[PDB]
Subunit: 250 residues, 5 copies
Amino acid sequence: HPLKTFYLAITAGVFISIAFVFYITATTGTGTMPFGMAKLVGGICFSLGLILCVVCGADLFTSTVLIVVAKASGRITWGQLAKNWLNVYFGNLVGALLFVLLMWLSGEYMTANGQWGLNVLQTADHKVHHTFIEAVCLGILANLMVCLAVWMSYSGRSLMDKAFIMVLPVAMFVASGFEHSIANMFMIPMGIVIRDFASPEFWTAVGSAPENFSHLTVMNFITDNLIPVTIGNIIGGGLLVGLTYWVIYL
Amino acid sequence: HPLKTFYLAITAGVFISIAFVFYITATTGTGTMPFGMAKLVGGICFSLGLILCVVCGADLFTSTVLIVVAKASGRITWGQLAKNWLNVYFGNLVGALLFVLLMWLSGEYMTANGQWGLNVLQTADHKVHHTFIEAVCLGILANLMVCLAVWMSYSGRSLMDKAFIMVLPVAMFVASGFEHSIANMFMIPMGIVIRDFASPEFWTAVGSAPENFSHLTVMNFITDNLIPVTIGNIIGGGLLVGLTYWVIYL
Amino acid sequence: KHPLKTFYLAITAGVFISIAFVFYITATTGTGTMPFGMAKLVGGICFSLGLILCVVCGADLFTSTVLIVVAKASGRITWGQLAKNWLNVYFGNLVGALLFVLLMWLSGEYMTANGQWGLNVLQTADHKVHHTFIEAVCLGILANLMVCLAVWMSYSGRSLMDKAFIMVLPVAMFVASGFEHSIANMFMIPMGIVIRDFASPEFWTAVGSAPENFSHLTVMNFITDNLIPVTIGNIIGGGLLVGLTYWVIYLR
Amino acid sequence: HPLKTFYLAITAGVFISIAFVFYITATTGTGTMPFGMAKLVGGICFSLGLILCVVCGADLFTSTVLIVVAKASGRITWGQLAKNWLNVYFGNLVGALLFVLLMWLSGEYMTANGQWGLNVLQTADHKVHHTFIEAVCLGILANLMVCLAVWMSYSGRSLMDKAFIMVLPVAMFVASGFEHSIANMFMIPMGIVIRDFASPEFWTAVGSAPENFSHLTVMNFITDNLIPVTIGNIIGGGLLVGLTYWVIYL
Amino acid sequence: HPLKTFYLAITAGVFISIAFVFYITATTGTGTMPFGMAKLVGGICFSLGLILCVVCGADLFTSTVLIVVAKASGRITWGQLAKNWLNVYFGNLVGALLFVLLMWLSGEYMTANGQWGLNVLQTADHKVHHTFIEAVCLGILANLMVCLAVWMSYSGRSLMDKAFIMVLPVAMFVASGFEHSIANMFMIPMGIVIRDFASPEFWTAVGSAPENFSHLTVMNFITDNLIPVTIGNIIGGGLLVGLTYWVIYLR
């Protein structure tokens, strides 16, 4: 049902924001840690987002592309196969924005004397510094792992089976910083809010200023991550789709 | 039976205190370690409490809200969902206060040359220094992960699935330090008891003193934490139930 | 029940709990650049191997099963006709821990990691006798709570996976939180004592310490300042769970 | 169909490239860290590529030797069993090169502040630094572990069983750094792309120069790594056939 | 089938050598790490060998000893039993030796700038330094835990159970430094080969001289370690044999 899908898409937006919150939380205070392993533990923590999404059934942009193809044995028609994408997309964003608001209200950016807020500003910052092609390609790369993770999940029967199997694929595109439109729908707007609203005690604790993140604003988010990344994402999904259809009608 | 529910509430209060002690113990001496990792491991250890609770049938204030609604097929009025709430709540409390007690008689505060008891004091102090809205939102975010853990658990094959699916949603809320009213029923009174009743050799070890924790009276506990945290908790359950109503409604 | 069989299952539990503690000492050997909680966690997780040994091989650990033992026969089994057993199992567990002390000594393992291993034993044993009677009982209560809960939660077990990987958290937690368990002690403290009373001069010198740093590691100390109050707290760790269980139950 | 199988081999080629990217990411920034621990953890990350392959039904050169023996129940032919190697091998290669391109365009070679690209250079190089004999022996060793890993995997039930039983055997050959021709197909050429097309800003940022990594070329890769490593790989498969053959045979 | 046994025995030989190699790899350059943490982890790694053995049906000397005793069902008379251990033993051994040669030809003692090969060296040099009493006691402790591991393995439903169960009991016999005759059959000889054939570049890079490892000789491996560890190993097998026997033999 259209409205049902919108609400479950809102839910995914929240699920993915929880994923990123856990990741930021885990990687916060790890300047001394080897970059690989800080990012690794962050990715492993990020997978709560997909274990959640799946185990709970929640529509997340393109995530279940291949499940949907397999629930037709690749003999169903396409309008029927990819209708709601835009409604899901919008539901995802709504969910992520809402969660950002809550997260802001919780005053958590000051966790660890601001280091939490800083991990957000640096993460969200880095993400808005992508050349259109690099961002598309990181978007391709990211949704590759997401779709494959979800896909592999379907063979899993127990709770243990579905979770302990997606952890690796999620941790990999995360700990590699591949770009995912929906995760960034929380992360980048979050770097915005914090940059554009953090008190002086923050900036002072963390030693820094909005100057350092002159790039975190809505306009940049949209044109320098969200757009190229989302595309790359549809390419990642449409790709698995493609290989799917040949392996099947062969 | 009303009184049986009360004993199971008391049991949850106890299981949750077990969880918070394990957490304190994991994180003791982690000023040297990176904030994330220390808190991640803490939260993970803390999940033993929510595992005990579920896999043992203890009643933890509001944890099961989604299940009760699911079973009741969606047809249940709020007064009907809420009758036991106050009974569970207070049974939880007696359980947690009782645990504070045994925990104290065991003389655990001196563990690690005062560093343990000190872990308690710092952890609890930090909680009463919360702005009312921050505390509500932390309470909301706590109960989101709690209900979702219980819910993901509700449909597990193995005992393994039932328990270990919950580990991550728990660890994430405890690593981010969201506020669970009932786990605070142990952490904060445990602090205050140490504050009000610790031996001076203790203060000589930790190099510190009671004035440093002026905000650890019971009144500060209740007004500066327990009240807004319980509120936010309930809101967190209300939002999942409401979400439920959309997808049990459509 | 059957005399010799229960006795050997008991001994075996003593060896299983001793193995638990050894693995703990080994995991937590040399812990400097390491926070207290983290080393104790990793060691305690290492520790649960022992209780997994007991539950999966059916060895008889003093009180570990309390909830099952009363809730099977339905209390349909009388006081003394229930006590004779525990005393037996207990003495068994001890024989086991003790034999394992002998072996772990003959093995010359206290010299492992250049004395550090055996020193780890020394310190870990030193700690356990500096408990006030009350504290030590309360810790006996706390330790057996976790153990019976771990075992208890073990019965819900589906797979081997379920029956084992569930007990790990309640064991690691009781153990890394420093709770007191009488049968584990039956190995740990005597091992501290042999090492402290027999460690070569090369040892004392390599570890950089001395007998007087552990003035308290003596048999009568162990028995009176630990084994008694911890054992008692342990029994209350059982009486507690049984009380709450039977009535939670009888509120039908 | 030769083309469905070529698609599956391409799939394994991509799968194994993803494995190696996860390994580079997991081990980027580890001088403070002990050799064995960082290699072990990169090894563990690596095995995502082989769980992907096996759980998704791809086609990795020789990986399923003992499978196509015992599964055919011994009723299978040498010649009309090994003729496809050529096709699978080429398909693996195209998977490899294609991912090199994607990872190049993604601008990942700069992620982690240049140390991603540096890690690739150091590893990719390292592999062309073996005697013919070292290369072959590392080939037997690598592929011995891969085949045993699948052989154990092809004996499991749940998703867990099928996938986890493979970790130890894979992380093992990867931490020990034994040489698998198919992994080398991504690693070495990706190092070459990075080295040649690597912007001057990159060389400047890491503090190196193409000169540092002279050994990284097509000819050396092919002749001092690829050739001997493939030979040894084949020997490790052959020896597993010989052996497992007599085993499940008598 | 006797020769089949020989092959599964050789295969355990190789299985258990892959065990020790994984171990040397996880533990190279862990000089700075807390002793117990590094060993605990190397021991988590080592269980590859034992899991490989169980899962793939390889026969590791005395490791499945409770089965070689309770299958003939105590009907397992003495001569009737000794007619096999000899075979598995020689098989394990051949397999370990072969893996030694492959590891040497791989050029591997130089990984991490000789630190890996030095790891082998020092671990070799350490096993050869025990009293007879200690070596037997530790051989007892090792095969004891391997038997408990394989034994709890038989109660396992899923593959996941067959393997993850053996992980703690093997990690423990290993992190604790207990002696398993078949695993020493690879490690001490690997140290010897390395010490006897290692390059000038190697000694020079790791900071050392062959002269630091003069205790690593074949005669020493045998009389100082293999004989007593082996005895301990048989006591860790025939011991659970004795015990278990009468346990299920009374009530």
